[PDB]
Amino acid sequence: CPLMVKVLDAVRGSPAINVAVHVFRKAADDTWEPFASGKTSESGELHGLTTEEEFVEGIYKVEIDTKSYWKALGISPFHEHAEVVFTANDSGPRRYTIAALLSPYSYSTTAVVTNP
Amino acid sequence: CPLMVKVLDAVRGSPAINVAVHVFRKAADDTWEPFASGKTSESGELHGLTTEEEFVEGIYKVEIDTKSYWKALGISPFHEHAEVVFTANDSGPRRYTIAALLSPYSYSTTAVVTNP
Amino acid sequence: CPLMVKVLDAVRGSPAINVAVHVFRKAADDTWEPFASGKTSESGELHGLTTEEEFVEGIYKVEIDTKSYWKALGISPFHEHAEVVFTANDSGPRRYTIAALLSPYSYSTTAVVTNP
Amino acid sequence: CPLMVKVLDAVRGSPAINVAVHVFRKAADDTWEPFASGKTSESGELHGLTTEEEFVEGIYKVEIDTKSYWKALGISPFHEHAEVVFTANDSGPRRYTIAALLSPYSYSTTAVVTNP
Ligand SMILES: O=S(=O)(O)C(F)(F)C(F)(F)C(F)(F)C(F)(F)C(F)(F)C(F)(F)C(F)(F)C(F)(F)F
Ligand SMILES: O=S(=O)(O)C(F)(F)C(F)(F)C(F)(F)C(F)(F)C(F)(F)C(F)(F)C(F)(F)C(F)(F)F
Ligand code: NA
Ligand code: NA
């Protein structure tokens, strides 16, 4: 997969299921254009956002809708969302995994980048 | 001091010094308007961003310019910046510390919200 | 898998490959008895440590040999190892994933626990 | 103050107050001998563990009793405790801050090592 998003819940020790994720790409006029979106599965994973052909060079933003996730579990969390902003594919195609671990007042995020 | 930002470096085991930090407040037209900014001190801290009178309820974004920090250290990083987006909420007196721990391909962030 | 260990490198944005992992189980005399060991694969994963039958109730320690990992990459890190100590299977068999994200002066660890 | 421990709570967005912390120093027979201990303050901090004269080079372990902390909050946790194991190294003057951010199924820890 060229782009995969994985979200975990540090309170429950589980994948974070049904988390909305929106991806944007910076356009030539410097605005954030919608690129792809989806929801995490029962494994906390979101696959199928894009294809190698579509996922050209650019600056991308992955917005993870953490507030809605916590609210539905009865928690009023600190953050509106978790955002991950990065340049992709500027030295040719890569595969990106964006992972996030969520707590009500914190999050950690990392990237795993591999060359296919 | 109702808002403080603290930035640490997980590669060097040190405060992240001279990191640019920009704070924005969401306007009624849903755009981000500049609110305060500065550079972290030798302790990785940025104080004096705002006052109690000015820091009213609303949605705020703290951008930390991590890419320029890593570039200055000669280390290739993943993210363009780290972003922390949250709502300020008057529920009694409040002080907010936004902390971030930086690595080249990762960051962790937390909020410590206390009442003096 | 009843027990899986996954290790990532926050400096390189990659799995942490060839990391030694030692698992211990607390014995009746309160000493740490060797239980299983192995090394992470090219995907940063270590599978096959134990079986559902062997992995009885108990207190377990997963020791990840982070210092050796960093030293081989030219970094003199802070920690000797990362240790994860937990009670397992005390409400019946579960599947455990122990994940760790490594930096030279930091680590983050989480657990994902699922009921088969 | 050559050694300070700071503990934060990612569920409540607060310092982790009244957490027991035990420090050990590895003896020549390779056992862990008690060195210092205390409970975190209302700021999540534990100062006064040791002195410059006493804190000689060696291998130290900081155990943070996270399970009892979560139990007191009525939250089921994963870990028995969080452990931080490191070597103290005289390379000019040094102060060590060991910080930990706690969630029920996760923890993050970093070291900030500075020269005053
Ligand atoms: O530097 S301080 O010890 O004052 C601190 F505020 F506690 C802190 F270390 F920065 C921190 F807030 F704990 C912290 F940096 F956020 C931290 F939580 F400890 C951390 F471990 F670094 C971290 F969790 F990774 C985070 F910074 F949140 F990313
Ligand atoms: O490899 S997977 O993406 O399936 C994963 F195990 F979930 C993971 F990526 F390793 C992960 F656990 F999510 C993780 F990336 F390590 C993570 F939890 F998100 C993490 F952010 F790296 C982390 F929180 F720091 C962890 F180190 F796992 F605690
Ligand atoms: Na290029
Ligand atoms: Na039982």
Query: What SS3 string covers B28-41?
Result: CCCCEEEEEEEECC
Contact flag D10-A103 (C-beta cutoff 8 Å): yes
What radius of gyration, in Å, describes the C-alpha atoms of chain C? 14
Please write down the HEC assignment for all residues of chain D.
CCEEEEEEECCCCEECCCCEEEEEEECCCCCEEEEEEEECCCCCEECCCCCCCCCCCEEEEEEECHHHHHHHCCCCCCEEEEEEEEEECCCCCCEEEEEEEEECCEEEEEEEEECC
Do C107 and D109 meet the contact criterion of CB atoms below 8 Å apart?
Answer: yes
What radius of gyration, in Å, describes the C-alpha atoms of chain A? 14
**Rounded CA separation A87/B76 (Å):** 12
Length of chain D: 116
B72 Cα distance to chain centroid:
19
Q: Which of C110, C112, C113, C114 is the best mutation target for the ligand 2 pocket, counting ligand atoms within 8 Å of the beta carbon and taking the most?
A: C110
Length of chain B: 116
Residue B86, chain A, CB below 8 Å: the answer is yes
CA distances from A88 to A25, A48, A97, C95 (A): 10, 17, 12, 35
**Rounded CA separation A112/C14 (Å):** 5
Q: Which residues pair with B9 in a beta bridge?
A: B14, B102
Domains, chain A, ordered by start: 1-116 (2.60.40.180)
Length of chain C: 116
Do C67 and C51 meet the contact criterion of CB atoms below 8 Å apart?
Answer: no
Task: Output the CA torsion sign for D4, D7, D8, D14.
Answer: negative
D78: left (phi over 0), alpha (psi -120 to 50) or beta: alpha
The chain D residue lying nearest C89, using CA atoms, is: D78
Do A104 and A77 meet the contact criterion of CB atoms below 8 Å apart?
Answer: yes
CA C65, D22, D112, D25: dihedral to nearest 10 degrees?
-60
CA distances from B98 to B62, B80, C86, D114 (A): 8, 19, 30, 21
**Rounded CA separation D49/D5 (Å):** 9
Q: State in Å: Cα D61 to ligand 4 middle.
A: 30
Contact flag A14-C108 (C-beta cutoff 8 Å): no
In chain B, which ranges are E strands? 3-9, 14-15, 20-26, 32-39, 45-46, 58-64, 79-88, 95-103, 106-114
Give the gap in angstroms from C-alpha A104 to the nearest C-alpha of chain D. Answer: 5
Q: State in Å: Cα D103 to ligand 2 middle.
A: 14
Q: What are phi and psi of A56, to 5 degrees?
A: -80, 175
Q: State in Å: Cα A52 to ligand 1 middle.
A: 37
CB atoms inside a 10 Å sphere around CB B3? 24
D45 Cα distance to chain centroid:
9
Q: Experimental method used, please?
A: X-ray
- List, edge to edge, every strand of the sheet that includes B79-88: A32-39, A20-26, A58-64, A79-88, B79-88, B58-64, B20-26, B32-39
> Which of the 8 DSSP states describes residue A90?
B
Length of chain A: 116
For the Cβ of B4 lying below 6 angstroms from any atom of ligand 1, the answer is no
Partners of residue D106 in chain C, C-beta under 8 Å: 108-111
How many CA atoms are closer than 13 Å to the CA of C61, on its beta-carbon side? Answer: 18
CA distances from D67 to B110, C86, D102, D104, D105 (A): 21, 10, 10, 9, 10
**Rounded CA separation C96/C115 (Å):** 9
- B·D CB contacts under 8 A: 29
**Rounded CA separation A71/A93 (Å):** 37
Resolution in A: 1.3
**Rounded CA separation B102/B105 (Å):** 8
**Rounded CA separation C35/C5 (Å):** 14
Do A60 and A22 meet the contact criterion of CB atoms below 8 Å apart?
Answer: no
CB atoms inside a 10 Å sphere around CB B65? 19
Residues in CB range of D11: below 8 A, 6 or more apart: A11, A103, A104, A105, D73, D75, D102, D103, D104
Tokens 């500065």 sit at which residue?
B38
SS3 at position B11? coil
What letter represents residue A109's amino acid?
T
**Rounded CA separation A115/A76 (Å):** 39
What letter represents residue A84's amino acid?
V
Partners of residue D8 in chain B, C-beta under 8 Å: 110, 112
Q: Which residues pair with B87 in a beta bridge?
A: B59
Tokens 């699922």 sit at which residue?
C114
Which one, of D63, A60, C57, lies nearest residue B79 by Cα? A60
Residues in CB range of C62: below 8 A, 6 or more apart: C5, C21, C22, C23, C83, C84, C85, C98
